[PDB]
Write an enzyme that holds these catalytic residues in place. Structure first.
Site, short mmCIF file in Angstrom:
data_model
loop_
_atom_site.label_atom_id
_atom_site.label_comp_id
_atom_site.label_asym_id
_atom_site.label_seq_id
_atom_site.Cartn_x
_atom_site.Cartn_y
_atom_site.Cartn_z
N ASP A 1 38.67 38.59 29.66
CA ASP A 1 38.77 39.92 29.95
C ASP A 1 37.47 40.79 30.00
OD1 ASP A 1 41.22 41.10 31.09
OD2 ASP A 1 42.32 40.23 29.07
N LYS B 1 44.30 32.78 34.01
CA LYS B 1 42.87 32.56 34.10
C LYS B 1 42.48 31.99 32.51
CE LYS B 1 43.08 36.28 35.33
NZ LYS B 1 43.77 37.21 36.39
N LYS C 1 20.99 35.52 29.70
CA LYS C 1 19.94 34.73 30.35
C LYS C 1 18.87 34.31 29.20
CE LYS C 1 16.95 37.57 32.83
NZ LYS C 1 16.45 38.49 33.45
N1 LIG Z 1 49.70 25.87 35.56
C1 LIG Z 1 49.38 26.69 34.72
N2 LIG Z 1 48.34 27.28 34.52
C2 LIG Z 1 48.13 28.26 34.05
N3 LIG Z 1 48.95 28.84 32.80
C3 LIG Z 1 50.14 28.03 32.99
C4 LIG Z 1 50.56 27.27 33.83
N4 LIG Z 1 51.81 26.89 33.59
C5 LIG Z 1 52.08 27.57 32.60
N5 LIG Z 1 51.11 28.47 32.00
C6 LIG Z 1 51.31 29.60 31.24
O1 LIG Z 1 51.26 30.80 31.70
C7 LIG Z 1 50.62 31.55 30.91
C8 LIG Z 1 49.27 32.18 31.75
O2 LIG Z 1 48.99 33.43 31.39
P1 LIG Z 1 47.53 33.97 30.91
O3 LIG Z 1 47.55 34.93 29.76
O4 LIG Z 1 46.86 32.87 30.84
O5 LIG Z 1 47.26 34.83 32.42
P2 LIG Z 1 46.06 35.90 32.46
O6 LIG Z 1 45.80 35.84 33.99
O7 LIG Z 1 45.13 36.03 31.79
O8 LIG Z 1 46.83 37.31 32.62
P3 LIG Z 1 46.61 38.84 32.20
O9 LIG Z 1 46.22 39.36 33.85
O10 LIG Z 1 47.61 39.57 31.94
O11 LIG Z 1 45.30 38.72 31.73
C9 LIG Z 1 50.22 30.94 29.51
O12 LIG Z 1 51.16 30.92 28.75
C10 LIG Z 1 49.95 29.50 30.15
O13 LIG Z 1 50.40 28.53 29.10
#
Ligand SMILES: Nc1ncnc2c1ncn2[C@@H]1O[C@H](COP(=O)(O)OP(=O)(O)OP(=O)(O)O)[C@@H](O)[C@H]1O
Ligand SMILES: Nc1ncnc2c1ncn2[C@@H]1O[C@H](COP(=O)(O)OP(=O)(O)OP(=O)(O)O)[C@@H](O)[C@H]1O
Ligand SMILES: Nc1ncnc2c1ncn2[C@@H]1O[C@H](COP(=O)(O)OP(=O)(O)OP(=O)(O)O)[C@@H](O)[C@H]1O
Ligand SMILES: Nc1ncnc2c1ncn2[C@@H]1O[C@H](COP(=O)(O)OP(=O)(O)OP(=O)(O)O)[C@@H](O)[C@H]1O
Lengths: 536, 411, 166
Positions: B275, B220, B302
């Site tokens: 986060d 995300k 807001k």
């Molecule tokens: N289709 C995709 N969409 C998103 N991220 C991708 C994709 N393909 C590869 N990635 C890579 O996967 C990782 C996504 O991890 P990210 O830190 O964004 O996740 P997160 O949901 O914030 O995790 P957490 O729950 O630990 O916070 C990044 O390194 C991103 O570049």
């Protein structure tokens, strides 16, 4: 027409090793336009750089570089300011001191115009007179007037083109933000620890003179010394050489009544590899290296193979080390070692870290934070983790997590600040190109799972207890306390039952039992073992 | 001018010299005797600290603020600072000034001049060759020319803006790029584009918010960073919990307030809050959290900027229900869902685009997966692949499949 | 013929009453050099701006003059710091004594080892709280020989008793 550089200047004569790129960048950005033919530079219509800043940890060679730069230029005798040497108690007398440094440059610029020479100025420990403007509520008001005067003098309404300022500091985050803009102090450099190919150069630089006069034995190899000294700063290599020389020279001096030199034997003075080994054992202890004291203190009774699980744990540790060291899609990996109490999971983590062979290894333990508030604990953790981002390969061990969070089942109660810091610190990747491994140990997995903490770690490893009579007998045999006559009696009773005990408790039980009379020890050992219970 | 002139109630460890100077300046600028042939110019960096009695009309009237330029100003400065080179045929013909003006964002005049100077020096240095003795060529010195490579290299290495760069930020937030392993990614990007367009065009709703929600390890943060990067707004900033380690409530609130105040200064801005549950310290036991940060967020979500200015806010979280119980889900305009991988075809496509387990190994994996459903996030798949690759060549597919089985599923 | 510099400092620490000041006093009067300089705790602090640093700088003037005049034939100069933990402490931790302690520490660091090189000084420090001292003052090239004076054993007690009943 006179060249700015000295006629006899030579790079190898400076006596600096391990900073080739830094000097190349400094020369290109500072002295490139002062060596090109004047007419073309005039056609380009550009100005000259008038500032350099050097920062880094202690002992890595900042003052040496400034001195060698000062002695490399065919110019006047550079001015030197030693710390807060300008302050004065009379109103308006600490600013005249600042103004006095530029009085010769201004006069020569006015007189000779564009044909003047070069004037150098050196500020040592610059952060003593150039902190931010507004902080530090000194009620005198002399700490902002000086900064304003310096700013207005370096770059003001009247223009100067024949100055150069060099600054050196250990705390670059406190300097004023208006003093570092690209018009005042444009070049900024970091001087850090060297690698093997720099340590070799430093050792050669500091041993050339000894080699010249045949005062160094033939059984000393510089390459092995370079390999053995890991994460040593420039100062510590010179200190090691000095200690070796002192040890060599002390063998010809007898001092029980009156200092008396052999004199004869002093003709055949030679430095041997034994002196170097003794110096590495006793005298010089680094700051960003690794020390045997920690490993000796955390693995007290060694590691004995009483079964298969030991080998499994060690193999998994090796696999994770290899993954950390040879992968670019995942620069950060962490694991959690868990098991029942007294099962010996701190020594295993220490052994894995020791066998990793990384340059930087640190252990964060609660033994050194007694009475601390949570803020101090966060500061200590943050410092330990910040020290690990200045190396190419790092390993960090977090020991006794439940003692780090101040957990107690009643309530329950704990510290939220430390938990949040640790959760945010398990996902921060290092600067690009660096690797970090984290090994955390605990004995309460359910609590950590309830705190949503098992999503931060990547994998878990299990450290079990002794669970069979054969394993207990093998452990006793390896320890070597009870002989065959008594071992048979022990086996008669334990072979027909299952057991549940940790090694750290088995050792205590054995030493408790060994205090009775010679013919009463086995009975007491069996009684204690039975009373211990199993309750798997 | 702020070195000598300051409020008269000030430093108390004073000998009385810093007030008689202010009084004498005030009485001399405009007193009983009148003058009509003086003009006074003052320059300062801290306008607030100056005495109020010196700023009334008749003493210091014309107050002017000099700020960072815009693209047209940057083009003007770049044209001013290269005319001498252009006149003497010292500048190459492949240098496009407009590209530089577009690339140099958040620069000021001094930084642009320093960029030009560094580019010039990098070209002068190709003739001075000296490792043990300084010696200029003077043969090729008459063919000196500054090219585009010099400017590019100097922009990457030497000069760095003081108003944030976001190059390293985008490097560290999107570490492995974006791969189209399915349809949902396109939908998320399309929704982001629509929200950006609505913020840019509409004038009746200057403030817009959106929430990106999904299960953990879905990616995300990368999608939000990508949307912000593709927005192409003058001002873009990310507020992360991982630059506030060890801070208290007040420090966190101050940091967010400063970031939002900086945002309000521009003409149209975008902000990212990633986060949320880590920004306010949530822990299920209790529960516990910081109320001050929650109230600050609810107030700032807001607040509309000064008339004629526009702001977009993108928030990311992994616990929707918790935010619902605090009543924060009603402060957002809309929400977007970031799903996990749910089918074998998507997993096989992801493996294809990742470049691993080629040929027959892929056939074995496909044979083993298609008769089941899967539930895996994109971020954990890379970890599983790198873990499996450390085995021997004969035990790689088996380890990967074992890890996949052990992962489990829970839709 | 070896191109080696001389060590520039010593540090002694331990519990009270175990013989740290006695050892420094006896070392001071074993060498042929002139009288040593003694700093009795924090006796350089002053109320006015820029006066503590002047008191610090005043301790080294003779060494600089002799080094300039004579060079490699100069004598030896000794400075003794008593209760050194009362002046030198970790920079950026305490309130800075209102910006006074940081300046003193910086001045001392600059004087001991700086752009201008000295080779005829020896600095001795003694403290009861070794953990409060700055980390940049305890590196090679600075006060680098660290020693601990602890309780004696039976042989040491016998030697002391023989000393004190002669
Ligand atoms: N289709 C995709 N969409 C998103 N991220 C991708 C994709 N393909 C590869 N990635 C890579 O996967 C990782 C996504 O991890 P990210 O830190 O964004 O996740 P997160 O949901 O914030 O995790 P957490 O729950 O630990 O916070 C990044 O390194 C991103 O570049
Ligand atoms: N790169 C190097 N090559 C050779 N010698 C070095 C190097 N770096 C340091 N040294 C040795 O270290 C000695 C002292 O180091 P120096 O005073 O230059 O460090 P520093 O960075 O100024 O430390 P501090 O932080 O205390 O100011 C030098 O005289 C030299 O002998
Ligand atoms: N094979 C072994 N594995 C682990 N420890 C061993 C082994 N053989 C001997 N030991 C010793 O057993 C002891 C294990 O104690 P350790 O402090 O590591 O346990 P622990 O479970 O972390 O303790 P606690 O749960 O009380 O914190 C150490 O002294 C270690 O040297
Ligand atoms: N090793 C020793 N041999 C003989 N006498 C000793 C010894 N150590 C201490 N003493 C006696 O102790 C007296 C005072 O001790 P001294 O002043 O040297 O201790 P100190 O460590 O400086 O104490 P403090 O920590 O309080 O400053 C000396 O004058 C001497 O009589």
């Amino acid at each position: 027409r006179q060249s700015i550089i000295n006629p006899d200047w030579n790079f190898e004569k400076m006596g600096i090793g391990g900073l080739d790129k830094e000097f190349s960048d400094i020369f290109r950005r500072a002295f490139a336009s002062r060596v090109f033919p004047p007419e073309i530079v005039e056609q380009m219509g550009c100005k000259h750089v008038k500032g350099i800043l050097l920062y880094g940890p202690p002992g890595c060679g900042k003052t040496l570089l400034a001195r060698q730069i000062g002695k490399m230029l065919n110019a006047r005798e550079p001015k030197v300011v030693n710390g807060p040497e300008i302050l004065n108690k009379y109103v308006g007398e600490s600013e005249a001191n600042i103004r006095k440094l530029f009085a010769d440059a201004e006069e020569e610029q006015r007189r000779l115009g564009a044909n003047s020479g070069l004037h150098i100025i050196i500020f040592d420990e610059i952060d003593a007179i150039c902190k931010q403007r507004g902080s530090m509520a000194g009620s005198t008001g002399v700490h902002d007037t000086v900064v304003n005067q310096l700013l207005s003098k370096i770059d003001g309404v009247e223009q100067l083109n024949n100055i150069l300022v060099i600054g050196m500091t250990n705390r670059p985050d406190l300097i004023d933000e208006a003093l570092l803009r690209p018009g005042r102090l444009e070049v900024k450099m970091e001087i850090g620890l060297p690698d093997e190919k720099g340590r070799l150069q430093i050792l050669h630089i500091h041993t050339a003179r000894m080699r010249g006069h045949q005062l160094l034995s033939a059984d000393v190899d510089i390459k092995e010394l370079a390999v053995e000294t890991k994460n040593f700063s420039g100062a510590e290599l010179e200190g090691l050489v000095r200690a070796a020389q002192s040890t060599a020279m002390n063998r010809h001096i007898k001092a029980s009544t009156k200092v008396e030199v052999d004199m004869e034997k002093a003709e055949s003075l030679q430095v041997t590899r034994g002196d170097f080994l003794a110096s590495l054992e006793n005298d010089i202890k680094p700051a960003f290296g690794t020390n045997q004291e920690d490993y000796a203190s955390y693995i007290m009774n060694g590691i004995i193979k009483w079964g298969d699980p030991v080998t499994r744990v060690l193999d998994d540790g090796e696999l994770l080390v290899q993954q950390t060291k040879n992968s670019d899609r995942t620069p950060l990996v962490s694991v959690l070692l868990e098991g029942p109490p007294h099962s010996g999971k701190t020594a295993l983590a220490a052994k894995i870290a020791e066998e990793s062979n990384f340059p930087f290894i640190k252990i964060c333990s609660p033994d050194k934070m007694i009475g601390f508030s949570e803020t101090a604990k966060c500061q200590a953790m943050k410092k330990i983790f910040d020290d690990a981002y200045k190396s190419q390969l790092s390993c960090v061990v977090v020991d006794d997590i439940e003692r780090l969070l101040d957990y107690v089942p009643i309530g329950p109660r704990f510290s939220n600040l430390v938990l949040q810091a640790l959760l945010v610190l398990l996902k921060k990747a290092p600067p690009q190109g660096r690797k970090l491994l984290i090994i955390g140990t605990t004995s309460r997995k359910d609590v950590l799972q309830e705190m949503e903490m098992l999503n931060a770690f990547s994998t878990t490893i299990h450290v079990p207890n002794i669970a069979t009579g054969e394993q207990l007998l093998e452990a006793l045999e390896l320890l070597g306390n009870f002989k065959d006559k008594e071992r048979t009696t022990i086996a008669q009773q334990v072979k027909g039952k299952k057991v549940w005990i940790g090694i750290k408790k088995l050792l205590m039980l054995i030493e408790m039992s060994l205090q009775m009379d010679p013919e009463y020890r086995v009975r007491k050992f069996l009684a204690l073992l039975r009373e211990e219970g199993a309750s798997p």
